[PDB]
Amino acid sequence: GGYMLGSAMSRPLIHFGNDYEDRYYRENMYRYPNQVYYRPVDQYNNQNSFVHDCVNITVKQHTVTTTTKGENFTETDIKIMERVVEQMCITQYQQES
Ligand SMILES: [Cl-]
Ligand code: NA
Ligand code: NA
């Protein structure tokens, strides 16, 4: 029946340990989501399980929306996107709980 779609937020500040990824996130920040998709929080007993699904669903949605427009993500984009989305999913879980 579809998923819950969180409110847009400022893309998070993340100090990536890989220096090149750290720079790449800043250079290309607008490529990544600023909103997450999820199943309702009360369907989970813990944060980690929620976040796991929230990351998978959000990355799936974002990649599908992008590919159908004839655009592409790099391998670096995917690594950064997963981290960005994980942080926003954690935020969403803590906020919505
Ligand atoms: Cl932003
Ligand atoms: Na480093
Ligand atoms: Na594509």
Residue numbers in the entry: 126 to 222
Recite the paper's sentences.
Pathogenesis in prion disease involves refolding of the host protein, PrP, from the monomeric, primarily α-helical cellular form (PrPC) to a β-sheet enriched, aggregated infectious form (PrPSc).
In wild-type rabbit PrP, the side chain carbonyl oxygen of N171 hydrogen bonds to the backbone amide of S174 and the side chain hydroxyl of S174 interacts with the backbone carbonyl oxygen of N171. These reciprocal interactions, flanked by the hydrophobic interactions of Y169 and F175, form the basis for the hydrophobic staple helix-cap. The electron density surrounding the N170 sidechain is fairly weak suggesting it may be disordered. At pH 5.0, no β-state forms in the S170N mutant, whereas the S174N rabbit PrP begins to form the β-state to a maximum of 12.6% and the S170N/S174N double mutant forms a maximum of 37%. At pH 4.5, the S170N and S174N single mutants form 54% and 66.6% β-state and the double mutant sees a larger increase to 84.9% β-state. Under conditions that promote β-state formation, amino acid changes in the S170N, S174N and S170N/S174N mutants of rabbit PrPC cause successive increases in the population of the β-state at equilibrium, whereas the reverse mutations in hamster PrP (N170S, N174S and N170S/N174S) cause successive decreases in β-state population.
